[PDB]
């Protein structure tokens, strides 16, 4: 996260770290949506241009964390993966269209002060809140600058951007399964996702029921925190029919 700040303890209790078994390293962010399901970006698991193709046994998820590198004894919980599900129309060839994946845990995780699931949006919450100028929140342990790494989880609040401005900022083809967020050059404030924040959550707090909803997944950007560029996030509600199909049947 660029130009964010240290998270408070328990601020993002749905935050998940995707961790490689060997070598032991951070791979991505992710989010907890039930006691056995974790949501992430498909490009965290499958991205052939970089020879990335992770299988279940390659990976662990670490839940309840704050520190990036420490083993947080008596606080974090480490879970093995039963199965990975990638969206069948994930477009890794062109523009990361439908950049979404689910991971089922081998055993359900116990909730705690530090471990708790986020809500997924209903149609009405999405229609109400996914509006230009309205702010959401991104969390992660990724890089602090485009060209280092944080000691603890980072947080940044960012406004959703009008779709014509998103489109006019890039030569990459945008789709309805994406939205973009960040400040404009003239707006003063800064901030963005970056490498390593991939797969983490873009959340909003509903003013109607005071619950946190995951509206987006950290997906793609050209650089990090560049003027006139914006971060792009998977549109969770647009892909919720697939989410529900996987969970109902698996």
């Amino acid at each position: 996260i660029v130009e964010g700040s240290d998270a408070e303890i328990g601020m993002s209790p749905w935050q998940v770290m995707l961790f490689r078994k060997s070598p032991q390293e951070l791979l991505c962010g992710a989010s907890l949506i039930s006691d056995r399901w974790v949501l992430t970006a498909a490009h965290c698991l499958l991205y052939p241009p970089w020879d990335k193709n992770f299988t279940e046994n390659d990976l662990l998820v670490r839940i309840g964390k704050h520190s990036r590198t420490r083993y947080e004894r008596n606080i974090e919980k480490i879970s093995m993966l039963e199965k990975i599900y990638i969206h069948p129309r994930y477009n890794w060839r062109e523009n990361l269209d439908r950049d979404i994946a689910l991971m089922k845990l081998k055993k359900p995780v116990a909730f705690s002060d530090y471990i708790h699931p986020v809500c997924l949006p209903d149609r009405e919450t999405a229609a109400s809140l996914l509006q230009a100028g309205y702010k959401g929140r991104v969390t992660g342990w990724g890089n602090l600058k485009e060209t280092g790494q944080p000691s603890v989880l980072q947080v940044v609040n960012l406004p959703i951007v009008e779709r014509p401005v998103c489109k006019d900022s890039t030569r990459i083809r945008i789709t309805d399964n994406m939205f973009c967020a960040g400040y404009k050059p003239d707006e003063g404030k800064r901030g963005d996702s970056c490498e390593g924040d991939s797969g983490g959550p873009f959340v909003m707090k509903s003013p109607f029921n005071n619950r946190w909803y995951q509206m987006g997944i950290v997906s793609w950007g050209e650089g990090c925190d560049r003027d006139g560029k914006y971060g792009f996030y998977t549109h969770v509600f647009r892909l919720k029919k697939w989410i529900q199909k996987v969970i109902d049947q698996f």
Binding site: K21, Q24, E25, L26, T69, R70, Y71, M80, Q149
Partner: peptide
């Protein structure tokens, strides 16, 4: 750069 995690989880 990461503190080693318990062997239990790497079984």
């Amino acid at each position: 750069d990461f503190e080693e995690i318990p062997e239990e989880y790497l079984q």
